[PDB]
Design an enzyme around this catalytic site. Structure first.
Site, PDB file in Angstrom:
ATOM      1  N   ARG A  71      56.620  75.715  14.487  1.00 51.25           N
ATOM      2  CA  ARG A  71      55.275  75.167  14.512  1.00 51.25           C
ATOM      3  C   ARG A  71      54.703  75.336  15.911  1.00 51.25           C
ATOM      4  NH1 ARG A  71      55.404  68.980  13.066  1.00 51.25           N
ATOM      5  NH2 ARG A  71      56.455  70.058  11.322  1.00 51.25           N
ATOM      6  N   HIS A 116      59.930  71.346  16.323  1.00 52.87           N
ATOM      7  CA  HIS A 116      59.490  72.503  15.558  1.00 52.87           C
ATOM      8  C   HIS A 116      58.997  73.630  16.437  1.00 52.87           C
ATOM      9  CE1 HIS A 116      59.852  71.614  11.356  1.00 52.87           C
ATOM     10  NE2 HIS A 116      59.740  70.336  11.666  1.00 52.87           N
ATOM     11  N   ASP A 123      61.771  72.079   7.635  1.00 49.38           N
ATOM     12  CA  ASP A 123      61.432  71.090   6.620  1.00 49.38           C
ATOM     13  C   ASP A 123      61.703  71.704   5.261  1.00 49.38           C
ATOM     14  OD1 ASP A 123      60.586  69.167   8.391  1.00 49.38           O
ATOM     15  OD2 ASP A 123      58.496  69.837   8.356  1.00 49.38           O
ATOM     16  N   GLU A 181      62.996  60.986   8.695  1.00 53.03           N
ATOM     17  CA  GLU A 181      62.442  61.923   7.735  1.00 53.03           C
ATOM     18  C   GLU A 181      63.549  62.700   7.039  1.00 53.03           C
ATOM     19  OE1 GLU A 181      58.553  62.384  10.640  1.00 53.03           O
ATOM     20  OE2 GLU A 181      59.978  64.047  10.446  1.00 53.03           O
ATOM     21  N   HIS A 184      63.488  66.578   7.496  1.00 51.37           N
ATOM     22  CA  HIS A 184      63.643  67.171   8.830  1.00 51.37           C
ATOM     23  C   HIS A 184      65.071  67.515   9.254  1.00 51.37           C
ATOM     24  CE1 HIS A 184      62.593  68.147  12.980  1.00 51.37           C
ATOM     25  NE2 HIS A 184      63.600  67.395  13.377  1.00 51.37           N
TER      26      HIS A 184
END
EC number: 3.4.13.22
Lengths: 202, 202
Positions: A71, A116, A123, A181, A184
């Site tokens: 990301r 990320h 993910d 999460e 993750h």
């Protein structure tokens, strides 16, 4: 394509991903900055270890569905900017009921810095190989609630078990989970910690 | 990759597609047979003309979001098989209220033969280049209702106008529209009419 990075789809052959951030189907309501392609990008090492996790198809007939890998920093900034915008209630119900957009960057859902951006975080979910449907996890990707926590309660025994299986497959494949999460995972010995990239996903 | 066909994303540079059929987010509830990789595949000529339609970014700041291009015969069979299954009401509300799964292959929503299998048909929308959101069309992709008709009523003036703009951009780019589905376009002088392919999208 940046060095040490690859399109994961060409490494993880029969994967049925869906680059959530490359479509309007994410919490911001539209493709985040830096996402100009519906493909998951990642470091060769991430692909290598994802391949090992996907080969854990030996487990209870699970397939992996990737949502987000590398990301760009600008995507993270886009998230931060979005968190700072007034509530239009467009994605609230689906992605963050129970929490407010004011506290997004304090309860820690949208941080200024993401693992990320290092390119070794991923993910994903697992789909039943035998039935083809999505393995129920109790909360949606990017749920942003205590419900999304690995150790969460209010999730059925199957859902909690399912998360445990995802985690187990990942941990046994060179990944480290994250308690807040269930989706993750970060490569344990990633090639570029300290390196937060900003080349677009395209 | 089959001859005369290409991955459209490599020709249509900054496109933000979402291979709906390569994800559980379609009317069958899961990736159709032949849809592995989340990418839009298509004939070089389809890409060429899509490029011309996408260059009609000159129109009211629109971007194109591709949903489906070449569709394997087996995907079409998968649709047919699905239409023949008992109603679980899983996707009904979203994709086909007002119609029944019994009449799917008679009202003509799921035919035994698709122009898609020829590789020159494409499903898409336009997103506002200025704001980034999706241009409102009045009905969702694969809506399967009279509401999805180009000439439909019960759709606002903006929505009807929007469809008209999509259509106009496509028609001016070498495509032929289809009255029953505002999202459906076929290349007018396609390279393989009569040819229904069955290689997977991967």
């Amino acid at each position: 394509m940046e060095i040490g990075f690859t399109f994961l789809d060409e490494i993880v052959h029969g994967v049925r991903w869906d680059a959530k951030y490359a479509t309007w189907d994410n919490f911001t309501g539209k493709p985040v900055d830096g996402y100009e392609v519906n493909r998951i990008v990642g470091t060769y090492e991430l692909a290598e270890s994802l391949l090992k996790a996907k080969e854990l198809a030996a487990t209870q007939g699970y397939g992996l569905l990737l949502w987000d890998g590398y990301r760009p920093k600008r995507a993270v900034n886009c998230f931060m900017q979005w968190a700072a915008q007034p509530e239009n209630n467009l994605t609230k119900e689906s992605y963050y009921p129970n929490i407010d957009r004011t506290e997004m960057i304090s309860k820690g859902y949208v941080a200024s810095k993401s693992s990320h951006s290092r390119g070794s975080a991923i993910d994903l979910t697992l789909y039943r190989l035998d039935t083809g449907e999505l393995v129920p996890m109790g909360s949606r990707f990017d749920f942003m609630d205590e419900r999304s926590h690995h150790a969460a309660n209010g999730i059925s025994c199957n859902e909690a078990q399912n998360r445990r299986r995802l985690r187990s497959i990942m941990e046994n494949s060179g990944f480290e989970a994250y308690s807040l999460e269930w989706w993750h995972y970060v490569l344990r010995d990633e090639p570029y910690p300290n390196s937060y990239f900003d080349f677009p996903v395209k």
